[PDB]
C-alpha cells in the first residue's frame, strides 16, 4: 500500500471507457433527484460533526487560525483549539446543549479577544467580556487579544512604588510593590477574599487624592464562585463607590469550564490596558485554584494524559503565562504597572500541593492565612513567619519601613517565646516581657473587615505599639487604644507623615509628644 505506488495511480491507465461516459450522463439526474436531502457543502464556513462534553469537532473551516474565536449559529462562541487534517476541535464558551450536529460554524476572523478600554470600567462582564450587569453593551471600548505574551526583560524595571493595600498586617509585614505578584494562599474561610477586597476599597480611597497618574484601576476576576457572592460583592463595591475604578470579570460555578478557564485571561487583558498606557492596575484572580480545576476538566475531556493530582502538565504554564503579564514596565514603555493577587485555596493547610507550589514558584511572595489564627479571632490571620514579600521590601513606605523592622523582630521573638512555652508552668519574667509585647502587637495588627486604613494611620499606630505608649492596656483594649490613638492625636501629624513620607526628627518629636497626651481606655 505504498505511496509512490499510489501516486502512479494518478495518471490514467485504463484505455477503456465503457463506464466513464455511462455514469457521466447519469450522475446529474441522480444528484438532482436527491437534492433537498443535501446540506449545502461547506468549505470556508464550518459544520459541526460531533459535539459533546463542551468540545465541538467542526468539519470545514478551511482558513481558521489556531486559537481563533469562532461562532456557532446558535450565537454561542467557541475557540478553534486544535486544527486537524479533517476537522477542527472547538472549545465552547458556554453551554454545549444549544449545539447540534449539522450546525453552521461561522468564523469571526480574529483570535479570541475581549473589549478593553475606559468604558469597561464600572461594569460586570462575564468570562468573555460580554456584560452581565444589565446596563447595556460596552461603549467606549476596543477589542484586544486575551493571550498576548508578557513583556520581556528589556521592557521591565524594578518595582519602586509601594501600592498600599490598607491592611495593617499586610502593609506592615508583607508590603506589596507596584508591579509585584503576591499570592494570597490559605484554607477555606480564612479571609483570602477579604484582603483583596480591602485592597480594592483602599485603592478607591487613595484615588481621590493622587494626581491622576498614580491612580490604580482594579480588576476582580471571580472564577468558579457562586453568583450570589459576586452579586453581593458588586453591591459592596457600589455601596463604597469602588466600582468607578474596578471591573468585575466573573465566570461563576455554573458557567462552562472554558469560560472559567478563560476568565483570568480576559481580566488580565482588561487590566493590561491600564498597564500598557502608563496607568496602574491591580488584578485579583480570586481562586486561581478553581481556574486550574476548570482547565483540568477541559484537558481530561480532550483525553489529554493526566499527571500530578490529575492535572495536565501544562497547568504550570496555564498560570505562569497568566501571571507573567503582571509587570512593572520601563520608562520608554510608559512606566505602567500591573499588580496581581492570585488566590489559591489549600486543603487542610497543605501548601505542598501541586497547584499551590506551582503558583509559589511564579509569584513574588505569599500571604499565608492560617486557619488556627483565624479561629482564634486574629483576623487577618496572617502567618507572619511564612508570608514573604521581598520584592515589595525596599519598595514600601519609608515611615512604615522604619517601624516595621522592629515590629518584625519583636514578632519573631514573640513566635519563638511562644514556641518556647508549649506549657504554662515556668515563668521567666524576661521572656514574659516579649510574650506580652507580642500579644500586644498581635492585637494591634488585627483589624476588622471593609475598613482599610491609610498608611500614615498604620505607621502612627505601629509606632505607638512597638515603642511605649501602649504598655498600660493589658491585651484586651488595644483595639480601643489604637482607635483612641488615631482619633485623639492631632490630624496634622498624619499630613506631615504623608507628605514627607518618612519620620523626620522634627516629626517623631511631635510623635512622642502627641502620644503621651492621649487617654488609653485600659487603665
Amino acid at each position: 500500500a505504498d505511496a509512490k505506488a499510489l501516486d502512479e495511480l494518478r495518471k490514467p491507465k485504463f484505455s477503456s471507457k465503457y463506464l466513464i461516459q455511462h455514469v457521466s450522463q447519469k450522475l446529474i439526474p441522480a444528484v438532482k433527484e436527491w437534492e433537498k436531502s443535501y446540506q449545502p457543502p461547506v468549505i470556508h464556513l464550518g459544520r459541526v460533526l460531533s459535539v459533546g462534553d463542551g468540545i465541538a469537532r467542526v468539519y470545514g473551516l478551511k482558513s481558521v487560525q489556531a486559537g481563533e474565536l469562532v461562532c456557532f449559529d446558535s450565537g454561542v462562541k467557541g475557540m478553534a483549539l486544535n486544527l486537524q487534517a479533517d476537522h477542527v476541535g472547538v472549545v465552547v464558551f458556554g453551554n454545549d446543549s444549544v449545539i447540534h450536529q449539522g450546525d453552521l460554524v461561522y468564523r469571526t476572523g480574529q483570535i479570541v479577544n475581549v473589549p478593553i478600554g475606559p468604558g469597561t470600567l464600572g461594569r460586570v462582564t462575564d468570562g468573555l467580556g460580554q456584560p452581565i450587569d444589565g446596563k447595556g453593551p460596552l461603549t467606549n471600548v476596543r477589542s484586544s487579544l486575551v493571550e498576548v505574551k508578557a513583556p520581556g526583560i528589556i521592557a521591565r524595571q524594578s518595582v519602586r512604588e509601594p501600592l498600599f493595600t490598607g491592611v495593617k498586617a499586610v502593609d506592615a509585614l508583607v508590603p506589596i510593590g507596584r508591579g509585584q505578584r503576591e499570592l494570597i494562599i490559605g484554607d477555606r474561610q480564612t479571609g483570602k477574599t477579604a484582603v483583596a477586597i480591602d485592597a480594592i476599597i483602599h485603592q478607591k480611597n487613595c484615588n481621590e487624592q493622587v494626581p491622576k497618574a498614580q491612580r490604580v484601576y482594579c480588576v476582580y476576576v471571580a472564577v468558579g464562585q457562586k453568583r450570589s457572592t459576586v452579586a453581593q460583592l458588586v453591591k459592596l463595591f457600589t455601596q463604597t463607590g469602588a466600582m468607578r475604578y474596578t471591573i468585575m470579570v466573573s465566570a461563576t460555578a455554573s458557567d462552562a469550564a472554558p469560560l472559567q478557564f478563560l476568565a483570568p485571561y480576559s481580566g488580565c487583558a482588561m487590566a493590561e490596558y491600564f498597564r500598557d498606557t502608563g496607568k496602574h492596575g491591580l488584578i485579583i484572580y480570586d481562586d486561581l485554584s478553581k481556574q486550574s480545576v476548570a482547565y483540568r476538566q477541559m484537558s481530561l475531556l480532550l483525553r489529554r494524559p493526566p499527571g500530578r493530582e490529575a492535572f495536565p502538565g501544562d497547568v504550570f504554564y496555564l498560570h505562569s503565562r497568566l501571571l507573567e503579564r503582571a509587570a512593572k514596565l520601563s520608562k520608554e514603555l510608559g512606566g505602567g504597572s500591573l499588580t496581581a493577587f492570585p488566590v489559591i485555596e489549600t486543603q487542610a493547610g497543605d501548601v505542598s500541593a501541586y497547584i499551590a507550589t506551582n503558583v509559589i514558584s511564579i509569584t513574588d511572595g505569599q500571604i499565608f492565612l492560617e486557619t488556627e489564627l483565624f479561629y482564634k479571632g486574629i483576623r487577618p490571620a496572617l502567618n507572619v513567619g511564612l508570608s514573604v514579600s521581598r520584592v515589595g521590601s525596599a519598595a514600601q513606605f519609608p515611615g512604615m519601613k522604619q517601624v516595621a523592622g522592629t515590629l518584625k523582630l519583636e514578632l519573631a521573638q514573640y513566635r519563638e517565646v511562644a514556641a518556647f512555652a508549649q506549657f504554662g508552668s515556668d515563668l521567666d519574667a524576661a521572656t514574659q516581657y516579649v510574650l506580652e509585647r507580642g500579644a500586644r502587637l498581635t492585637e494591634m495588627l488585627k483589624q476588622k473587615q471593609f475598613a482599610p486604613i491609610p498608611i500614615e494611620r498604620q505607621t502612627v499606630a505601629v509606632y505607638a505599639a512597638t515603642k511605649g505608649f501602649l504598655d498600660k492596656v493589658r491585651v484586651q483594649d488595644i483595639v480601643a487604644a489604637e482607635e483612641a490613638v488615631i482619633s485623639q492625636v492631632n490630624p496634622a501629624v498624619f499630613k506631615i507623615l504623608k507628605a514627607n513620607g518618612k519620620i523626620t526628627p522634627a516629626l517623631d518629636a511631635h510623635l512622642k509628644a502627641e502620644l503621651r497626651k492621649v487617654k488609653l481606655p485600659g487603665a
Binding site: 467606549n140 518629636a509 509628644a513
Partner: protein
C-alpha cells in the same frame, strides 16, 4: 520554490505538523513559517509517515492556518556563539532581546550536538570554595563539577544560585553563562540590571570586556522555547569550552523546566505517557542534555543547576533522574527553611563526590562526617523529643541535642544577596575558618555559648562576639527616659509650621483614560465571515 517548502498540515497547541510534497527535512532541523506576525521557528521532532513532519514551535502558534508556507532551512536551530555574545541577552533561537543591536557572531553554532566522548573525559578533582559554610563543609563543590541545587518552591535555590554567582563568578577568571529556563522574567531583569552595575555586563563600546552572557527562555515562553533554551545556553558555553578552550561557569536556573516543557509537548506528539505524568523519554532527554555539560581535555564547565522538585517530592522522576547526573547535589529543605535556617540545605541529604579523605584532606573529611553523625543522632532522637520532651534523655543525649542544635544554627549564614531584604550584611566564610569552627563545636570548646549566638553568623569568632552582644543587652532593656532628640525647640519647627511647608498637588478628577483612545464601534450582532470571507452579521437560524 515548491520542494523544500512544505505547508502546515495541522496545529495542536505547540505541536505543528508540516506536509512536504518532497524532500522532507531531517529531524532537529529548523523550519521557518512565512506569513506569521512574529518569527515562528519550528524544530522538527518526528517523521510522521505520509510525507509529514511533526514539529515543535519556538513561539506561540496562534494565527497558524492550515495552508501556511513553511520554509526549510536545512539545518538545526543555530545560535550566534563567540566572544561577541558576551554581555548580550539572547532568546532560544539566538535573537538579541536586549535592544543592543545585532550580535557580533564569531560563529553560528547548531544547538544540537553529541556529548564529548569517553576519550575526551577529564577526570581531575579540585575544590571550589564558595564561602558558604554548609556547602564547603558537608557537600563541597568541584571546580569542573556538575552541581545541582534541589529545591521545593520557595526554599531558596534562586537566592543560593545568585549567591554562588556573587561569590564564585568573580574569583573565577573565565567566562560565565546564565541560562534562564522557565523562571521569572522579573528575576532575569534583576540579574541583568545588577550585572550591569557590577561591571560584569558592560554596555556599549565596552561590550567585549563583559564576563557573562545571558540566555533566557523564561516562564512566559511557550513549551517549545523552554524545551530548547537550555541547549542554547549549552551551545554558548560549549563554544567557550571547546573553541576558546577556557573555563566557563554555566548557571542554569531550573533545569526542571526543560523536562516539564518536554512533557508538555510530549503528550501532543502521540506518546504513551510514562510515570507520574511524564514523557517516556525523560531519562534519555535529560541525559542527552546533561552529558554535554562536562569538562573535557580542552576546556572546563563548572555547572550549577537549580532543580525544582514538584510537590516537595524527591521521588518525582525528574528530580530522581537528575540526581544521577550531578557530582554535588545540594538538597534544600522546606522544614529547614521553616526553622529560619538559611540557606535551607539539608545536611543529611546533600552529598558530593568530593567528600572523600583523599581529596579534601582527613581533617575536613573527619569534621564533616562528625557533624553529619551528630545531626543524624539528633534526627534519630527527634521523635522521642517531640513526645516525651527533653527531660527523658540521657545526659550524653542532651549533649548530642545541644551540640546538634548548635551546629544546626551554625550552618545558617547571611548572604550578600539576601542583605537587601534581611538587613544583615552577608559573610563570606573561608574554608579553614568553617573547618576550625565546626571542629571546635564538635570537640566541645563552645558548649558555654547559647544556641542563638551561632544563628546567622560568619565565623566562630562572630558567635563569640554575638554572645558578647547578646549578653551585654541582657541588662540593657530600659532607662532611656529623657534627654532625647524629641524636644520642641532644639530641632523643631511647630506642627502648624510643619504643615505650611507641605507642597500642593494638582488633583484633576478626570481619570485621564480617554486621552489617546481609539474606540472600536462594536456591533449589535456578532459579525462573522461568510463563505467568501466578507464580514457579514450572524444569520438567524440555529
Amino acid at each position: 520554490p515548491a520542494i523544500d517548502a512544505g505547508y502546515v498540515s495541522q496545529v495542536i497547541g505547540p505541536v505543528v505538523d508540516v506536509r512536504f510534497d518532497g524532500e522532507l527535512p531531517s529531524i532537529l532541523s529548523s523550519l521557518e513559517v512565512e506569513g506569521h506576525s512574529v518569527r515562528l521557528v519550528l524544530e522538527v521532532a518526528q517523521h510522521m509517515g505520509d510525507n509529514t513532519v511533526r514539529c515543535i514551535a519556538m513561539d506561540s502558534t496562534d494565527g497558524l492556518v492550515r495552508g501556511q508556507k513553511v520554509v526549510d532551512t536545512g539545518s538545526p536551530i543555530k545560535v550566534p556563539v563567540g566572544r561577541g555574545t558576551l554581555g548580550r541577552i539572547m532568546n532560544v533561537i539566538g535573537e538579541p532581546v536586549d535592544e543592543q543591536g545585532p550580535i557580533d557572531a564569531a560563529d553560528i553554532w547548531s544547538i544540537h550536538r553529541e556529548a564529548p566522548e569517553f576519550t575526551e573525559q577529564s577526570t581531575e578533582q579540585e575544590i571550589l570554595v564558595t564561602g558558604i559554610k554548609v556547602v564547603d563543609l558537608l557537600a563541597p563543590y568541584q571546580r569542573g563539577g556538575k552541581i545541582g541545587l534541589f529545591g521545593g518552591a520557595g526554599v531558596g535555590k534562586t537566592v543560593l544560585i545568585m549567591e554562588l554567582i556573587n561569590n564564585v563568578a568573580k574569583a573565577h577568571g573565565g567566562f560565565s553563562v546564565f541560562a534562564g529556563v522557565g523562571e521569572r522574567t522579573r528575576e532575569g531583569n534583576d540579574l541583568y540590571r545588577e550585572m550591569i552595575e557590577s561591571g560584569v555586563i558592560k554596555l556599549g563600546a565596552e561590550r567585549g570586556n563583559s564576563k557573562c552572557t545571558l540566555v533566557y527562555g523564561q516562564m512566559n515562553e511557550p513549551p517549545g522555547a523552554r524545551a530548547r533554551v537550555a541547549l542554547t545556553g549549552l551551545t554558548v558555553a560549549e563554544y567557550f569550552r571547546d573553541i576558546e578552550g577556557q573555563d566557563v561557569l554555566l548557571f542554569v536556573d531550573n533545569i526542571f523546566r526543560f523536562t516539564q516543557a518536554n512533557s508538555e509537548v510530549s503528550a501532543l506528539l502521540g506518546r504513551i505517557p510514562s510515570a507520574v505524568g511524564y514523557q517516556p523519554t525523560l531519562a534519555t532527554d535529560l541525559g542527552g542534555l546533561q552529558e554535554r555539560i562536562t569538562t573535557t581535555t580542552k576546556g572546563s564547565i563548572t555547572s550549577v543547576q537549580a532543580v525544582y522538585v514538584p510537590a516537595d517530592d524527591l521521588t518525582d522522576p525528574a528530580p530522581a533522574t537528575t540526581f544521577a547526573h550531578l557530582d554535588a547535589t545540594t538538597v534544600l529543605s522546606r522544614s529547614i527553611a521553616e526553622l529560619g535556617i538559611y540557606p535551607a540545605v539539608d545536611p543529611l541529604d546533600s552529598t558530593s563526590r568530593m567528600l572523600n579523605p583523599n581529596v579534601i584532606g582527613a581533617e575536613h573529611y573527619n569534621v564533616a562526617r562528625g557533624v553529619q553523625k551528630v545531626l543524624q543522632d539528633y534526627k534519630n532522637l527527634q521523635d522521642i523529643i517531640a513526645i516525651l520532651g527533653m527531660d527523658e534523655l540521657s545526659e550524653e543525649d542532651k549533649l548530642t541535642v545541644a551540640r546538634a542544635r548548635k551546629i544546626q544554627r551554625f550552618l545558617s549564614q547571611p548572604f550578600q544577596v539576601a542583605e537587601v531584604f534581611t538587613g544583615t550584611p552577608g559573610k563570606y566564610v573561608d574554608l579553614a575558618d568553617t573547618i576550625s569552627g565546626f571542629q571546635g563545636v564538635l570537640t566541645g570548646k563552645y558548649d558555654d555559648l547559647p544556641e542563638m549566638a551561632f544563628y546567622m553568623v560568619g565565623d566562630i569568632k562572630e558567635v563569640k562576639e554575638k554572645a558578647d552582644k547578646m549578653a551585654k543587652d541582657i541588662a540593657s532593656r530600659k532607662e532611656a527616659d529623657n534627654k532625647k532628640v524629641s524636644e520642641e525647640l532644639k530641632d523643631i519647627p511647630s506642627l502648624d509650621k510643619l504643615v505650611s511647608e507641605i507642597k500642593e498637588v494638582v488633583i484633576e478628577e478626570d481619570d485621564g483614560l480617554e486621552e489617546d483612545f481609539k474606540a472600536e464601534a462594536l456591533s449589535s450582532e456578532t459579525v462573522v465571515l461568510n463563505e467568501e470571507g466578507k464580514s457579514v452579521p450572524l444569520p438567524k437560524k440555529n
